[PDB]
Design an enzyme around this catalytic site. Structure first.
Site, short mmCIF file in Angstrom:
data_model
loop_
_atom_site.label_atom_id
_atom_site.label_comp_id
_atom_site.label_asym_id
_atom_site.label_seq_id
_atom_site.Cartn_x
_atom_site.Cartn_y
_atom_site.Cartn_z
N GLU B 171 -36.02 27.90 88.98
CA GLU B 171 -36.41 29.22 88.49
C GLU B 171 -37.78 29.19 87.82
OE1 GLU B 171 -32.64 28.87 88.50
OE2 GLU B 171 -33.51 29.81 90.30
N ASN B 255 -32.21 26.10 95.74
CA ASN B 255 -32.96 27.21 96.29
C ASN B 255 -34.47 27.05 96.20
OD1 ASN B 255 -32.43 27.69 93.30
ND2 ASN B 255 -33.91 29.33 93.70
N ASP B 297 -31.09 33.55 96.42
CA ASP B 297 -30.85 32.54 95.39
C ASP B 297 -29.49 31.88 95.58
OD1 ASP B 297 -30.04 32.40 91.86
OD2 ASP B 297 -31.11 30.93 93.09
O1 LIG Z 1 -32.58 26.12 90.18
C1 LIG Z 1 -32.19 25.40 89.24
O2 LIG Z 1 -32.70 24.31 88.91
C2 LIG Z 1 -30.99 25.90 88.45
C3 LIG Z 1 -30.50 25.15 87.38
C4 LIG Z 1 -29.29 25.52 86.71
C5 LIG Z 1 -28.73 24.58 85.63
O3 LIG Z 1 -29.07 23.38 85.69
O4 LIG Z 1 -28.04 25.07 84.71
C6 LIG Z 1 -28.62 26.69 87.19
C7 LIG Z 1 -29.22 27.38 88.29
N1 LIG Z 1 -30.36 27.01 88.90
C8 LIG Z 1 -28.69 28.76 88.84
O5 LIG Z 1 -28.95 28.83 90.24
C9 LIG Z 1 -27.15 28.95 88.61
O6 LIG Z 1 -26.53 29.63 89.39
C10 LIG Z 1 -26.62 28.27 87.43
C11 LIG Z 1 -25.39 28.47 86.78
C12 LIG Z 1 -25.35 27.55 85.77
C13 LIG Z 1 -24.21 27.34 84.81
O7 LIG Z 1 -24.19 26.25 84.20
O8 LIG Z 1 -23.37 28.26 84.69
N2 LIG Z 1 -26.51 26.80 85.79
C14 LIG Z 1 -27.29 27.22 86.79
CA LIG Z 2 -31.41 28.47 90.78
#
Ligand SMILES: O=C(O)c1cc(C(=O)O)c2c(n1)C(=O)C(=O)c1cc(C(=O)O)[nH]c1-2
Ligand SMILES: [Ca+2]
Ligand SMILES: O=C(O)c1cc(C(=O)O)c2c(n1)C(=O)C(=O)c1cc(C(=O)O)[nH]c1-2
Ligand SMILES: [Ca+2]
Lengths: 57, 571, 571, 57
Positions: B171, B255, B297
């Site tokens: 992100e 993604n 995403d």
């Molecule tokens: O693109 C990334 O590096 C990244 C990292 C993380 C993360 O490490 O918590 C999440 C996400 N994306 C995101 O796509 C996602 O749906 C998400 C949910 C969570 C959670 O712990 O509930 N982390 C993350």
């Molecule tokens: Ca993500």
């Protein structure tokens, strides 16, 4: 663009109607700053150096 | 290493977050069963002294239990002979600004174990190895740099003498990579990126030889315009799996960045890819991109489950995986052959289907995303029909018990520049319940699947998304925690609820089990957070805030508040 | 008011923090008893989403339960039909600077109830009355000003149509006073200070007519030099008691300021006094100063327990109180005659004894404090042999089960200026375990007393101080929480431990009980803190920090971490 | 100073040997600023005024 028309194996992207084949020069040109794009590489270089220094001692 | 293998082969222990190398997250312990589960009661509890989301679950090695918290990532060691005493603890000192670059709450999915060491990371990018008995630091190295938006949240993975670790931050435009370190010294062995030259991606000479239509060489740059791949995402922050026999480890890359699909034309390989890599060299034997040119995403980092089942009359080494895109995949884990690609719920509309011959999704233009357009009623939403939860598999009935989400969305992107250290999303979302719930308000499901056909056996609906996952124990029970605060046990045959307990706060990790002095125990973390709880955790009221999650989970705060701890149950 | 009286007479309800007007903190519920207590188990739990010390206990009015947290003082209302749903909540917005003027952790001892309203205060000095059904604010007024170091922590007390509330802050030179407000409008009725002129203190014409030797008029200024009484403390932040028949309410005024005794010569009246005031006018009918010219910070705000027992074969209206100074007092609550004044433990050395005729403590110079001198081995320490804990009384065996502290200290004062809004302590301490523990390391005791003789019946030692208090239920059980995280039940006959459960964090409040749908439940807050936990809560390591508490409780962090919530138990 | 020697009922304080009977002018003189000493009274006055205008509405 249904993802089924491939120029070559593993490359099936097509521009959607109303959008350009190349965004450079278009109104969707992100115009990325080369200096900003290279910061991750420079960060990793420095970091690997610090790590190597730790392992050595 | 051999030490880990010893613990794995020790009945009643839990040395691996996913239940074992195959990541089936199950247990042969059958003391607790369908007939007596109603008598299960709380045994003891432990508060971490930290708030925010408490993902993952503790590890149990011998008579010791290891508990971890959310940022600042504290580690606590308890000897099961007396849970009231903390044998040793590690409390990291980290700059508070580290939290500003974490997208989805300051979570930590767990610890790892190997060579008599507790392998632990910190959100700020440090990876450490601590003596399991004393907590003494053996080594500490840097893996990610928060200054460029890179942090650590996933659980490390140990196989042989290697520690696998991947940074988070897609992100924020972080170029993903799986990093390998020496278990004994912390020295970097290799690094395999998700985008770029074949050299940096580390592809074997026979990469995808069995399925050349998946694509092979030069695609890491060829499927991008210019140097866009440098900030192209592809981070792997999910879970791994490993086959000792083939010496191949598996995981999915995330993604592509940004979320604005118009800013990155091309298939964007190799993001959203299921990998089969050699543990010693990191060279990829095969790779299957699930979602070419992501527009939603659908970070493809979800759990990989390895099983051996008869396919077309022949026992076959398989790999199953339920992606964010709502498709349940089953492939031959040896060569990458695609066997099953079915929708986990009929509501999935981004693809009409996945073509087994072309190996790509047949996209439906009505639900695509693109600049100057607002897509509506897109399913699954960015949170996916499945997220970071860890599911379980019952080898007897050959059934996978999946914790799913039933959430869809509206989506419109916007132009924005890339600045290292700043968010690089570029999309405004609105999320809401899917259309299939009993009262059209339900956002969670526990659904049993046959991995060889992709067909469902039964379904249990939940008010909120089943974020944490499920645990299966031989007594014929499916255990799982809910966002509203309950730990529940279901009859694995029909999904009937047989028991439950109201924990202090919602659970976002998956339950684990272990035995101590001949008695079986069930353990579950509690403390709501993660993406679903951002609104509650950071006091957000804007429906589109929290990347669109706030609106969808507005009622959660009327069911639970923050917390942080562990609850253990037994007969 | 009438509404409160109705709840008070409703079986299974719990509308008053101390258990009733007499504050005997007991219950006639006997479903759980000695024969089946071993079968008690956790029913459900609830996290407040806040850390730091969680004092007090919830209130149960009909089918509703009201829970409160530590600063920022949140209130949650739950319908017992479904503990998983928060019916309404009130989350105050307070300036973070409020925390800097709170001496002993940001605690809150609870809510009160009256006229269909939940009476609740906030640390920053505001007092509010919320509609019990909807949480709507009926009125809100200012009671204390944090800018001058005055804050609110004690539970409000409701009697008839009056709300009693006292500010905290003697460690900052705040001049104590009990403020009375109208239950319906929040209008200030009167205010009785602890120091100053007779008019400001509010003494009735026949004040102490039964014991003129206790002192009468003009002492509020005569026992001080100059205007020292203007910043002489006397804050009342403990608990109250009320006798409907006599229409008198009772409470104790706190310690004089500063701690440096040399800076304030004189008896310092009326700090450290047990009061008997008329509820409607606030005029004191009698007042007994327990500790003239305090030299050890024996803040005399501890619980007042009213009982009716035979004294020399004659039924007498009594008041019993265990002060910080280690003396158990029993007086006639009508006229204030001193009947009992015994040491709760033989380790008390600040006084050789309390002369029943002179009504004053016979001081021992060897354990006094004074400038240019380091007093050592003084017992009790400033934390006292009894603090904010609420004890219980069994009407049948006529026994009080007290939670005591066994801690002593070294003490040396130092000169300092008074500056409104700044701390005004002036003393350096070191605290450690008392001398009578089995292994000389124990700092807590549960000790049963006869209030007419002051003699103990039995003693149970605890590693840490018994800070929260005890609850007595007719089933013959004494319930209490420990700083290390356990809820325990003892046979009231001999102190034999019959049951226990390891909660997530230590408890510093007293347990409560109620019934719902014919089932008896036991409730206890959890989340360590308060003075004993300042080291843990604020990460202090200097043994002299936390006003000496840090060094004494250095091991606490090896047994528990912070937390914040409620746990409920039943058969 | 054992607390048993009272000048009058309710007033039994005595200076400890070696300490002054009155601290003003001694080395233990607190020299309190009269301005600071009155701040609490001033605060209460202003507060009571604010509460009064609340009940008024
Ligand atoms: O693109 C990334 O590096 C990244 C990292 C993380 C993360 O490490 O918590 C999440 C996400 N994306 C995101 O796509 C996602 O749906 C998400 C949910 C969570 C959670 O712990 O509930 N982390 C993350
Ligand atoms: Ca993500
Ligand atoms: O003089 C005061 O106004 C004052 C206030 C408070 C409080 O309200 O927390 C404490 C004390 N003193 C202090 O004497 C004390 O022993 C104490 C313990 C605690 C606690 O909650 O653990 N508060 C207080
Ligand atoms: Ca005090």
């Amino acid at each position: 663009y249904d993802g089924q028309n491939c120029k070559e194996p593993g490359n099936c992207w097509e521009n959607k109607p109303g959008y350009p084949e190349k965004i450079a020069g278009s109104k969707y040109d992100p115009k990325h700053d080369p200096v900003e794009l290279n910061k991750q590489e420079e960060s990793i270089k420095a970091m690997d150096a610090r790590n190597a220094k730790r392992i050595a001692n | 290493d051999a030490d880990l293998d010893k613990q794995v082969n020790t009945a009643g222990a839990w040395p691996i977050a996913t239940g074992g190398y195959y990541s089936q997250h199950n247990s042969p312990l059958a003391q607790i069963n369908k007939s007596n589960v109603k008598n299960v009661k709380a045994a003891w509890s432990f508060s971490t002294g930290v708030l925010n989301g408490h993902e993952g679950a503790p590890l149990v090695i011998g008579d010791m239990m290891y508990v971890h918290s959310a940022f600042p990532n504290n580690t606590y060691a308890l000897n099961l002979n007396d849970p009231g005493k903390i044998v040793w603890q590690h409390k990291p000192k980290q700059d508070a600004s580290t939290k500003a670059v974490m997208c989805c709450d300051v979570v930590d999915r767990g610890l790892a174990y190997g060579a008599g060491q507790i392998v632990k990371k910190q959100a700020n990018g440090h990876l450490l190895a601590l003596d399991a008995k004393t907590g003494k630091i053996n080594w500490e190295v840097e893996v990610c740099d928060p200054k460029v938006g890179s942090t650590l949240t996933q659980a490390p993975f140990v196989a042989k003498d290697t520690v696998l670790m991947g940074c988070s931050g897609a992100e924020l435009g972080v170029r993903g990579a799986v990093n390998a370190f020496d278990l004994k010294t912390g020295e970097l062995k290799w690094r395999a990126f998700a985008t770029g030259s074949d050299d940096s991606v580390r592809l074997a000479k026979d990469f995808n030889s069995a399925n050349p239509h998946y694509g092979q060489f030069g695609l890491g740059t060829k499927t991008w315009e210019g140097d866009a791949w440098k900030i192209g995402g592809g981070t792997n922050w999910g879970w791994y799996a490993y086959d000792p026999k083939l010496n191949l480890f598996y995981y999915g890359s995330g993604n592509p960045a940004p979320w604005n699909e118009t800013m990155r034309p091309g298939d964007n390989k190799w993001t959203m890819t299921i990998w089969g890599r050699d543990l010693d060299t990191g060279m990829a034997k095969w790779g299957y991109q699930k979602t070419p040119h992501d527009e939603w995403d659908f970070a493809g980092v979800n759990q990989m489950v390895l099983t051996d089942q008869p396919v077309n009359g022949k026992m076959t080494p398989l790999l199953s995986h339920i992606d964010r895109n709502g498709i349940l995949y089953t492939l031959n884990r040896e060569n990458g052959n695609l066997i099953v690609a079915e929708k986990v719920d009929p509501a999935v509309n981004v693809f009409k289907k996945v073509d087994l011959k072309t190996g790509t999704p047949v996209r439906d233009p009505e639900f695509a995303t693109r600049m100057d357009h607002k897509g509506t009623n897109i399913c699954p939403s960015a949170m996916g029909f499945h997220n970071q939860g860890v599911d379980s598999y019952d080898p007897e009935s050959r059934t996978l018990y999946a914790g799913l989400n039933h959430i869809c969305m509206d989506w419109e992107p916007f132009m924005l520049p890339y600045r290292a250290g700043q968010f690089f999303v570029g999309a405004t979302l609105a999320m809401y319940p899917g259309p299939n719930g009993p009262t059209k308000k339900e956002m969670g499901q526990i659904r049993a699947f046959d991995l060889t056909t992709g067909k469902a056996k039964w379904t249990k609906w939940e008010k909120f998304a089943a974020w944490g996952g499920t645990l299966y124990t031989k007594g014929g029970l499916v255990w799982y925690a809910t966002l509203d605060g309950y730990l529940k046990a279901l009859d694995n045959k029909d999904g009937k609820e047989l028991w439950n307990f109201k924990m202090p706060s919602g659970g976002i990790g998956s339950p684990m089990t272990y035995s101590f002095k001949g008695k079986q125990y069930i353990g579950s973390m509690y403390g709501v957070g993660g993406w679903p709880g951002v609104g509650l955790v950071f006091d957000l009221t804007d429906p589109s805030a929290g990347l669109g999650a706030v609106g969808a989970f507005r009622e959660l705060q009327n069911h639970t508040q923050m917390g942080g701890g562990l609850m253990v149950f037994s007969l």
